[PDB]
Design a protein around this motif. Structure first.
Motif, PDB file in Angstrom:
ATOM      1  N   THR A 105       0.861  -1.181   0.000  1.00 21.07           N
ATOM      2  CA  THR A 105       0.000   0.000   0.000  1.00 21.07           C
ATOM      3  C   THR A 105       0.897   1.230   0.000  1.00 21.07           C
ATOM      4  O   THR A 105       1.753   1.371   0.878  1.00 21.07           O
ATOM      5  CB  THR A 105      -0.939   0.014   1.209  1.00 21.07           C
ATOM      6  N   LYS A 106       0.700   2.118  -0.978  1.00 19.77           N
ATOM      7  CA  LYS A 106       1.512   3.328  -1.048  1.00 19.77           C
ATOM      8  C   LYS A 106       1.285   4.210   0.174  1.00 19.77           C
ATOM      9  O   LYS A 106       2.221   4.834   0.685  1.00 19.77           O
ATOM     10  CB  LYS A 106       1.207   4.097  -2.332  1.00 19.77           C
ATOM     11  N   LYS A 107       0.040   4.279   0.650  1.00 24.37           N
ATOM     12  CA  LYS A 107      -0.236   4.932   1.924  1.00 24.37           C
ATOM     13  C   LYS A 107       0.413   4.211   3.097  1.00 24.37           C
ATOM     14  O   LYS A 107       0.793   4.860   4.077  1.00 24.37           O
ATOM     15  CB  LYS A 107      -1.746   5.031   2.151  1.00 24.37           C
ATOM     16  N   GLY A 108       0.557   2.892   3.019  1.00 21.21           N
ATOM     17  CA  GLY A 108       1.090   2.167   4.148  1.00 21.21           C
ATOM     18  C   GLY A 108       0.024   1.956   5.215  1.00 21.21           C
ATOM     19  O   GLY A 108      -1.152   2.274   5.051  1.00 21.21           O
ATOM     20  N   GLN A 109       0.475   1.401   6.335  1.00 17.75           N
ATOM     21  CA  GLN A 109      -0.409   1.150   7.465  1.00 17.75           C
ATOM     22  C   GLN A 109       0.427   1.139   8.735  1.00 17.75           C
ATOM     23  O   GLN A 109       1.657   1.054   8.695  1.00 17.75           O
ATOM     24  CB  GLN A 109      -1.183  -0.161   7.293  1.00 17.75           C
ATOM     25  N   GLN A 110      -0.261   1.233   9.869  1.00 20.12           N
ATOM     26  CA  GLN A 110       0.395   1.324  11.162  1.00 20.12           C
ATOM     27  C   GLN A 110       0.463  -0.040  11.834  1.00 20.12           C
ATOM     28  O   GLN A 110      -0.548  -0.737  11.961  1.00 20.12           O
ATOM     29  CB  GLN A 110      -0.340   2.315  12.068  1.00 20.12           C
ATOM     30  N   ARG A 111       1.666  -0.417  12.260  1.00 18.59           N
ATOM     31  CA  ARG A 111       1.855  -1.617  13.055  1.00 18.59           C
ATOM     32  C   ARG A 111       1.345  -1.387  14.475  1.00 18.59           C
ATOM     33  O   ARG A 111       1.283  -0.257  14.966  1.00 18.59           O
ATOM     34  CB  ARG A 111       3.335  -2.016  13.075  1.00 18.59           C
ATOM     35  N   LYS A 112       0.960  -2.484  15.135  1.00 17.56           N
ATOM     36  CA  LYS A 112       0.537  -2.399  16.529  1.00 17.56           C
ATOM     37  C   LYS A 112       1.652  -1.841  17.406  1.00 17.56           C
ATOM     38  O   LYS A 112       1.389  -1.156  18.401  1.00 17.56           O
ATOM     39  CB  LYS A 112       0.089  -3.780  17.020  1.00 17.56           C
ATOM     40  N   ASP A 113       2.907  -2.126  17.049  1.00 11.09           N
ATOM     41  CA  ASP A 113       4.037  -1.600  17.808  1.00 11.09           C
ATOM     42  C   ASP A 113       4.101  -0.080  17.723  1.00 11.09           C
ATOM     43  O   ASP A 113       4.366   0.598  18.722  1.00 11.09           O
ATOM     44  CB  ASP A 113       5.339  -2.222  17.305  1.00 11.09           C
ATOM     45  N   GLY A 114       3.864   0.472  16.538  1.00 12.71           N
ATOM     46  CA  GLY A 114       3.964   1.905  16.343  1.00 12.71           C
ATOM     47  C   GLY A 114       4.879   2.263  15.192  1.00 12.71           C
ATOM     48  O   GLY A 114       5.144   3.441  14.935  1.00 12.71           O
ATOM     49  N   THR A 115       5.364   1.242  14.488  1.00 14.60           N
ATOM     50  CA  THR A 115       6.238   1.418  13.334  1.00 14.60           C
ATOM     51  C   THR A 115       5.390   1.349  12.069  1.00 14.60           C
ATOM     52  O   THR A 115       4.990   0.264  11.640  1.00 14.60           O
ATOM     53  CB  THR A 115       7.333   0.354  13.318  1.00 14.60           C
ATOM     54  N   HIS A 116       5.126   2.507  11.471  1.00 13.72           N
ATOM     55  CA  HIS A 116       4.285   2.597  10.282  1.00 13.72           C
ATOM     56  C   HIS A 116       5.126   2.267   9.055  1.00 13.72           C
ATOM     57  O   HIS A 116       6.007   3.042   8.669  1.00 13.72           O
ATOM     58  CB  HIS A 116       3.664   3.986  10.164  1.00 13.72           C
ATOM     59  N   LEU A 117       4.856   1.116   8.445  1.00 17.84           N
ATOM     60  CA  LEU A 117       5.529   0.754   7.206  1.00 17.84           C
ATOM     61  C   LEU A 117       4.772   1.340   6.021  1.00 17.84           C
ATOM     62  O   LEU A 117       3.580   1.075   5.840  1.00 17.84           O
ATOM     63  CB  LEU A 117       5.629  -0.766   7.078  1.00 17.84           C
ATOM     64  N   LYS A 118       5.467   2.135   5.213  1.00 21.84           N
ATOM     65  CA  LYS A 118       4.874   2.813   4.070  1.00 21.84           C
ATOM     66  C   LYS A 118       5.569   2.359   2.796  1.00 21.84           C
ATOM     67  O   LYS A 118       6.802   2.377   2.714  1.00 21.84           O
ATOM     68  CB  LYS A 118       4.980   4.333   4.218  1.00 21.84           C
ATOM     69  N   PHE A 119       4.779   1.951   1.808  1.00 24.85           N
ATOM     70  CA  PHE A 119       5.310   1.555   0.516  1.00 24.85           C
ATOM     71  C   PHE A 119       5.159   2.702  -0.479  1.00 24.85           C
ATOM     72  O   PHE A 119       4.685   3.792  -0.149  1.00 24.85           O
ATOM     73  CB  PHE A 119       4.612   0.295   0.003  1.00 24.85           C
ATOM     74  N   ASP A 120       5.576   2.455  -1.719  1.00 25.08           N
ATOM     75  CA  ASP A 120       5.423   3.416  -2.802  1.00 25.08           C
ATOM     76  C   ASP A 120       4.566   2.870  -3.933  1.00 25.08           C
ATOM     77  O   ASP A 120       4.548   3.449  -5.025  1.00 25.08           O
ATOM     78  CB  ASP A 120       6.795   3.838  -3.329  1.00 25.08           C
ATOM     79  N   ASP A 121       3.861   1.767  -3.700  1.00 22.46           N
ATOM     80  CA  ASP A 121       3.038   1.142  -4.722  1.00 22.46           C
ATOM     81  C   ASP A 121       1.927   0.352  -4.046  1.00 22.46           C
ATOM     82  O   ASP A 121       1.879   0.225  -2.821  1.00 22.46           O
ATOM     83  CB  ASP A 121       3.875   0.244  -5.640  1.00 22.46           C
ATOM     84  N   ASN A 122       1.025  -0.180  -4.869  1.00 20.50           N
ATOM     85  CA  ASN A 122      -0.092  -0.992  -4.390  1.00 20.50           C
ATOM     86  C   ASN A 122      -0.091  -2.289  -5.193  1.00 20.50           C
ATOM     87  O   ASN A 122      -0.520  -2.310  -6.351  1.00 20.50           O
ATOM     88  CB  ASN A 122      -1.416  -0.248  -4.525  1.00 20.50           C
ATOM     89  N   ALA A 123       0.387  -3.367  -4.575  1.00 16.63           N
ATOM     90  CA  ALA A 123       0.511  -4.658  -5.234  1.00 16.63           C
ATOM     91  C   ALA A 123      -0.221  -5.721  -4.426  1.00 16.63           C
ATOM     92  O   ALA A 123      -0.498  -5.559  -3.234  1.00 16.63           O
ATOM     93  CB  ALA A 123       1.984  -5.052  -5.425  1.00 16.63           C
ATOM     94  N   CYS A 124      -0.527  -6.831  -5.092  1.00 16.42           N
ATOM     95  CA  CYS A 124      -1.242  -7.920  -4.445  1.00 16.42           C
ATOM     96  C   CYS A 124      -0.820  -9.240  -5.073  1.00 16.42           C
ATOM     97  O   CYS A 124      -0.389  -9.292  -6.227  1.00 16.42           O
ATOM     98  CB  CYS A 124      -2.759  -7.732  -4.548  1.00 16.42           C
ATOM     99  N   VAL A 125      -0.948 -10.301  -4.288  1.00 14.75           N
ATOM    100  CA  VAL A 125      -0.704 -11.647  -4.757  1.00 14.75           C
ATOM    101  C   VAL A 125      -2.052 -12.315  -5.001  1.00 14.75           C
ATOM    102  O   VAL A 125      -3.086 -11.872  -4.512  1.00 14.75           O
ATOM    103  CB  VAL A 125       0.165 -12.453  -3.758  1.00 14.75           C
ATOM    104  N   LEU A 126      -2.046 -13.398  -5.772  1.00 14.32           N
ATOM    105  CA  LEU A 126      -3.265 -14.101  -6.142  1.00 14.32           C
ATOM    106  C   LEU A 126      -3.245 -15.503  -5.550  1.00 14.32           C
ATOM    107  O   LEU A 126      -2.257 -16.229  -5.690  1.00 14.32           O
ATOM    108  CB  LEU A 126      -3.408 -14.171  -7.664  1.00 14.32           C
TER     109      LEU A 126
END
Lengths: 122, 115, 229, 56, 119
Positions: free
Chosen positions: A65-86
RNA sequence: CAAGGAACUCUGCAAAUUAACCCCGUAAGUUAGCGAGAAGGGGUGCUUAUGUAAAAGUAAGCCGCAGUGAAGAACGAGGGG
RNA sequence: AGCGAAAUUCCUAGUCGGGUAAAUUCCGUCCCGCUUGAAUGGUGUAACCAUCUCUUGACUGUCUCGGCUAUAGACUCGGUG
RNA sequence: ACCUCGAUGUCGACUCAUCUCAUCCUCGAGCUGAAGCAGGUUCGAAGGGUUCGGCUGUUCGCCGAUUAAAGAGAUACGUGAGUUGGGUUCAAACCGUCGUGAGACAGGUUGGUCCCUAUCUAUUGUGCCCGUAGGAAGAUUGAAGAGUGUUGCUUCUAGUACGAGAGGACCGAAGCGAGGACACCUCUUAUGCUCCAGUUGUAGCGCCAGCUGCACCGCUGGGUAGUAACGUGUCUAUUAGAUAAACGCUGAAAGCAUCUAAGUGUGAAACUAUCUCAAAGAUUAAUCUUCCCAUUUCGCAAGAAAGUAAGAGCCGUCAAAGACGAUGACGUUGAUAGGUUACAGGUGUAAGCAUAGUGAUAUGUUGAGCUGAGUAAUACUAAUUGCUCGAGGACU
């Protein structure tokens, strides 16, 4: 911030490039999607020599997710694209090569076959 | 009695680290996270460059970005949070304490270093 | 049952790092040992409760009726006095330590007066949704929707009582449950609680025993720093 | 929207009852004979009793 | 809305603030609406605080906050200030100027007030 | 204004997207006139020098996060009636 | 003759393939065509339309999902009304 | 063929939804041609909820995907004195037909103007006078109601019962949830226009540098407090009573038998509570506590006359308030607001000096410089050398 008909990429060893969300599972009007969610997807951009063709209804799991998301720990991992597996209607994917590391924010949901072939477990 | 708002900082004197490695937004660093697997607290070394460093005392965090498998990935890390070991290999020379353009100006991954 | 009550002021709101790799946002509430001003009894007043007096002020300034009562009662001048039910396990004119009332990790509820939002909008007061603005759909977009239910002297003919409409927002004494007790400070009589405390900084906040999980007590471990050079 | 029926004299007077005003403030200035309202200057060249301006 | 008055936005207010602090430095007394004096008091006190040091950097800084008048020029006002007004208020921690509430204006009954200063 | 990006909708109404200059490249159809700024890409700064009546252009160094740095600048393609 | 669900076709949303995950709209076709049709003209027809419609790259608070900054009002004060 | 045509504006789309049950799911019970699972069946049952996209102007309707489900009606085919007219039903134009002709099509086709300064009631918030019976200040009971009563998946029990074989539960427990509501801006965002930084030309500050007026705040990157969610915490549980349907025991008329007749029970997402709001104009005018005093002495019944020793109001500073009102604090013995000082924090090495480079530029000076709202001390300033109402308890 992924929703229905969000044209999203795929970063696995398949013959498609862009697909579209048709329904994010959950209560009515989910309207949001984040890492680890399982969605139904309609293929909108696929090569004719791939394993699947355009327009096929299938099941996908979003991993970037280019927006990224927040980990429960507090470390927000942010990507630069939106990809998915099938996935083939189970906890196992359909691609045979993963392009890029996969976070641990969705490991607890299961799907360990995907993370076993991940480039790196973040 | 009258409030001071310094007590806000006073109550935070029990979860602080004395290593305090000062860095800048644009520093070539590696942050290693001591994360339990189930057992086996493993040391995940997250190398990269600093992007933003802003906050207020305990709320001071930072962003570290690298490129893995041709994919640029950036992550937030909190300074005072435990399991965080920070190392810096080259002190850069950045004109501002924040680099938003670095999110897109990934070219010239090597940065000018301070003197 | 025997729900206890304590008072404080929201002096800050920050984050506190807990074990198992979890960040806990924490409100900071400065407290003070309150003084008992009245003891309602199941027999004397048909109900047992405690009128606690708090927010102490100088003996120089107080309501002379109330201050004369305070000297007559030989108590100390405090600004506010409020009652709490079922908190009848002590005596008159007594300072109370929060340690004797709650544990450092159990679950409680918190009542507070919400922050004043003044003249709000029904779109925000009731959290409604506005449709498309394209195709040139007129100038008005923020309104209460259709107030018409029926017309004529046969179906509704009026606006009915109990209709969601805007007005003054906030300044409402409300209560939210299931807030973790995290930290104590006996040196300065202060508490560190989880959640988001209603109202702005400096307001009066009451903390009571959890209504539906009182016996449920699970402490929260502190994420000690691995600091080592 | 528009008014349907005309009002009455008594009803309009009851409505205008809130248009009435209250009493003003009045303080005392000693050196300059004058009853100036509170937190205001004095026309004799002073504010309260402290001389700060010209006598006007 | 469409074509109408341009308003009296904060930029216009701060420009009037510069004008009025220049005027009060020129004279020492200004009679105007109370509300504007309330806002300009802080900036005037800051300028007075910066006027004590008399350093070329501070001169350059205050250069951005004066105007041109007939009684004195910007340089003339600046040198007069830095010569005599600066050591006048070097002993008090703020409160160099006082606003006193005057009578309502004839036109719109606006609450008039005078900003003044003395040792 | 973080992300999605016509999914809202009678319909991309509207809005946004494109602009100005120089250098590449531009097709089908074509009644040779057009299409064409087609479709699409690169640069526009500072200092020195090469440079000319003036330039334009070029070489070296100089960085900013970005150099018609502000200003005003066609969005485009295909199908059908 | 030509064209033929067309500005014409009620049935009809006719069938078919493309389109579309999914299209009472669209593209070509099927010729018994309610009531088509050759200067009250017919068919191809280059370019063009502040012409209409569909798709498409980009594009965006149209939308997803609304919010904030400044004003003119809305509110208050004095005059008028 | 009617109260209404000296006027009741509609089809639809967006917003607001409500109520009801002939209940769709979630709740419960019973029967089965109900081995299990998946069911069908009949009722009690209205608390909550019951999708998205393409086409049609089309509501509707068709198709695809998804949940447990994508229930049905009414409120002027609800909803313009809340928005739009896409169609529809002005002329305008064509196609096919009809009338020879003006024209018409219950045919298609293209566009084709939706007025409002709120009088009253109802209705959502907030005030003014009085009441609440001597005046004033707090704390209440609770009279009355209102909000709220959504729910999915995974795992264990357990592949266990059942079932023969495939298949495959029931009960309970744990975790993961989603959605909406409540709360805050510390983690992610934006905004934050008298905050910071880089940066452009033009007109000037006489000139260089540095500056300000203009250019959306000139552009750009952010950002103090604050503001909002897209940021993060809680909530839906559990339980008592009356219980509906339903399941009952004893037990007659009716010597059997019978949940009903007397007695004795269980049992529903519904109801009375327990969660939250709120409160005596609750005239049903209540309760408790506290303070003030009876300053010699009158009137058609007592204080004409000293109207408090208590408090409030007028006025100012303001904010955790805040359209105004009103709320709260402070009012000189005052930190209430502003300013000074210092600090936090943000922006980001200021100007200028020196060195190097012909100039741009690089380095040291310098993390320096600046910083509306964040924090603390500070009477330096503003809150006045001020005024008004304000007690003898009317009576049992």
């Amino acid at each position: 911030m992924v929703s229905f008909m969000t044209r999203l990429n795929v970063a696995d060893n398949t013959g498609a490039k862009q697909v579209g969300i048709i329904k994010v599972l959950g209560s009515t009007r989910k309207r949001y999607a984040f890492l680890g969610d399982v969605v139904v997807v309609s293929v909108k951009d696929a090569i004719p020599s791939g394993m699947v063709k355009k327009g096929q209804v299938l099941r996908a799991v979003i991993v970037r997710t280019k927006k990224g998301q927040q980990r429960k720990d507090g470390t927000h991992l942010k990507f630069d694209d939106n990809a998915c597996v099938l996935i083939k209607e189970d906890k196992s994917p359909r691609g045979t090569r993963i392009f890029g590391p996969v976070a641990r924010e969705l490991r607890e949901r299961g799907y360990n076959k995907i993370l076993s072939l991940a480039v790196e477990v973040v | 009695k009258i409030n001071k708002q310094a007590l806000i900082d006073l109550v935070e004197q029990k979860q602080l680290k004395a290593y305090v490695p000062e860095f800048s937004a644009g520093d070539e660093v590696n942050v290693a996270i001591k994360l339990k697997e189930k057992e086996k607290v493993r040391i995940q070394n997250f190398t990269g460059t600093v992007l933003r460093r802003r906050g207020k005392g305990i709320s001071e965090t930072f962003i570290v970005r690298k490129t893995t498998d041709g994919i640029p990935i950036e992550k937030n890390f909190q300074i005072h949070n435990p399991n965080i070991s920070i190392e810096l290999k080259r002190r850069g020379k950045v004109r501002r304490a924040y680099i938003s353009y670095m999110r897109e100006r990934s070219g010239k991954a090597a940065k000018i270093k301070e003197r | 049952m025997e729900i206890r009550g304590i008072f404080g002021v929201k002096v800050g709101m920050s984050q506190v790092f807990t074990t198992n790799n979890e960040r806990l946002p924490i409100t900071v509430i400065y407290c003070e040992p309150n003084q008992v001003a009245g003891v309602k009894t199941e027999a004397k007043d048909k109900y047992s409760a405690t009128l606690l007096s708090f927010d102490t002020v100088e003996n120089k300034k107080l309501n002379k009726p109330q201050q004369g009562f305070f000297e007559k009662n030989n108590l100390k001048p405090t600004k506010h006095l409020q009652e709490i039910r079922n908190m009848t396990g002590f005596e008159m004119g007594q300072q109370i330590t929060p340690q004797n009332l709650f544990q450092v990790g159990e679950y409680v509820d918190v009542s507070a007066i919400s922050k004043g939002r003044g003249f709000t909008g029904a779109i925000k007061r009731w959290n409604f949704k506005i449709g498309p603005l394209g195709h040139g759909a007129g100038y008005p977009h923020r309104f209460q929707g259709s107030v018409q239910a029926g017309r004529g002297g046969a179906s509704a003919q009026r606006v009915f009582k109990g209709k969601k409409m805007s007005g003054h927002y906030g300044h409402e004494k409300v209560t939210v449950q299931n807030l973790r007790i995290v930290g104590f400070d006996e040196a300065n009589m202060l508490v560190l609680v989880s959640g988001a405390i209603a109202g702005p900084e400096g307001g009066v906040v009451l903390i009571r025993t959890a209504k539906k999980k009182p016996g449920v007590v699970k402490p929260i471990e502190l994420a000690v720093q691995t600091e080592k050079a | 929207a528009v008014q349907q029926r005309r009002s009455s004299k008594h009803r309009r007077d009851k409505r205008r009852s809130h248009d009435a005003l209250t009493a003003q403030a009045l303080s005392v200035c000693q050196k300059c004979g004058k009853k100036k309202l509170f937190h205001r200057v004095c026309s004799c060249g002073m504010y309260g009793d402290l001389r700060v301006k010209k006598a006007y | 809305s469409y074509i109408n008055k341009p308003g009296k936005t904060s930029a216009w207010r701060v420009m009037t603030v510069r004008q009025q602090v220049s005027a009060v430095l020129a004279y020492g007394k200004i009679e105007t609406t109370l509300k504007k004096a309330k806002n300009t008091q802080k900036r005037l006190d800051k300028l007075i605080t910066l006027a004590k040091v008399d350093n070329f950097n501070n001169r350059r800084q205050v250069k951005k906050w004066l105007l041109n008048t007939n009684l004195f020029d910007v340089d003339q006002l600046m040198d007069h200030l830095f010569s005599k007004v600066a050591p006048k208020y070097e002993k008090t921690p703020g409160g160099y100027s006082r606003v006193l509430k005057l009578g309502p204006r004839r036109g719109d009954a606006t609450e008039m007030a005078i900003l003044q200063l003395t040792d």
